[PDB]
Amino acid sequence: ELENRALRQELLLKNSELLMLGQYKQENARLRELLGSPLRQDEQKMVTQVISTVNDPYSDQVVIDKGSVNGVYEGQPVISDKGVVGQVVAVAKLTSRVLLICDATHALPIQVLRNDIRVIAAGNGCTDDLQLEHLPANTDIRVGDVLVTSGLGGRFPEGYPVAVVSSVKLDTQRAYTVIQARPTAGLQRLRYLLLLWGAD
Amino acid sequence: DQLELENRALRQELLLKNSELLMLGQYKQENARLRELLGSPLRQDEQKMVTQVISTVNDPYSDQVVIDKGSVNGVYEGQPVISDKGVVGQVVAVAKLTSRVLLICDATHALPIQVLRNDIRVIAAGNGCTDDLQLEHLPANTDIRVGDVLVTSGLGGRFPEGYPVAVVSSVKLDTQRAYTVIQARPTAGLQRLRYLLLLWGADRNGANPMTPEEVHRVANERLMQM
Ligand SMILES: [Cl-]
Ligand SMILES: [Cl-]
């Protein structure tokens, strides 16, 4: 079982990153004090496993092994190690269905890490990248830009990675920029996910 | 068969730690923005409260934003909003938990300012947020110069005195109409707003409006801690 130590060393490698995170979180708390703002509070998190995909050919959903008896709620965010995966759309008592962010009925408010541009990112089917709202011609948004949740829908906590801009194209005829972004989370062959609750 | 059981615990541990590290990029930028706002040159008797723009009012005819503070937080109509670099605008409509803010580059926004160099006082009006501010037409014999720094005069009873507003960007004599046309570039960024400070001024209950000299000295004091 080489997998035991492969996991152990990947965990060891996270330490310098985790220490750096600690410093950022402490500084953030100091800054929010000085500016009279309430401190950030950690989310509560719960590991969940994908049982199956919904074999609906027109919707991209998976079933997870947690439900109302575990406190799952409609609209609750779901993430993986690499980023946002989706949200809970239907809760049974032991299981729940999660709509994936690349589903065409899924839309998420996001922000560009680099320069704070805010825009909705909508799914277009999990065969394609996410589609941002059309932006003005002179918008400074770049392939490679990291898109994180803005929280402005009151649904997702602000700051989790969603996607990396993959395409920025000017439509000279119609005078706007067309932007697509590729999710950072793997959205195929899912196993373990995290449900998040904001603190109360 | 605890060996496999241990590796599921390890993978779960790794999932949780990775989910923590996902926040790193956000904290880097967030701490940066908050540290900038901390540079705001406030006076001792002045209170501040950070607030977040939670959207821009979709209107091609008005440059307004919505912020995440309201009457519950002590926000009042006509209250200034600032960045560390300049006046951003003022609260025009207060709800319970949110408020609407008029940016100083909106055509319906004007505020009285004072030239730092020589104490000249004049109204600076917005001309739409694609353009610089417009000073009101002045006599041809006005010594205002490109590069002059404009700060709040407080003459409207709205804005604490001596805070940066703009830098004069164009001075042009229209010899036919016989006045000086002057534009000024706001010193605060007015695009892609995120964090701002709501500002409460010090109480001056019966006090007379500040003299040009007092405003100049307050302005220089603010600029010394920048
Ligand atoms: Cl949201
Ligand atoms: Cl005023």
Author numbering:
A (entry chain A): 74 to 273
B (entry chain B): 71 to 296
Can you list sentences taken from the study reporting this PDB entry?
MreC is a scaffold protein required for cell shape determination through interactions with proteins related to cell wall synthesis. The periplasmic part of MreC contains a coiled‐coil domain and two six‐stranded barrel domains.
Here, we determined the crystal structure of the major periplasmic part of MreC from Escherichia coli at 2.1 Å resolution. The coiled‐coil domain is essential for dimer formation, and the two monomers are prone to relative motion that is related to the small interface of β‐barrel domains. In addition, MreC forms an antiparallel filament‐like structure along the coiled‐coil direction, which is different from the helical array structure in Pseudomonas aeruginosa. Our structure deepens our understanding of polymer formation of MreC.
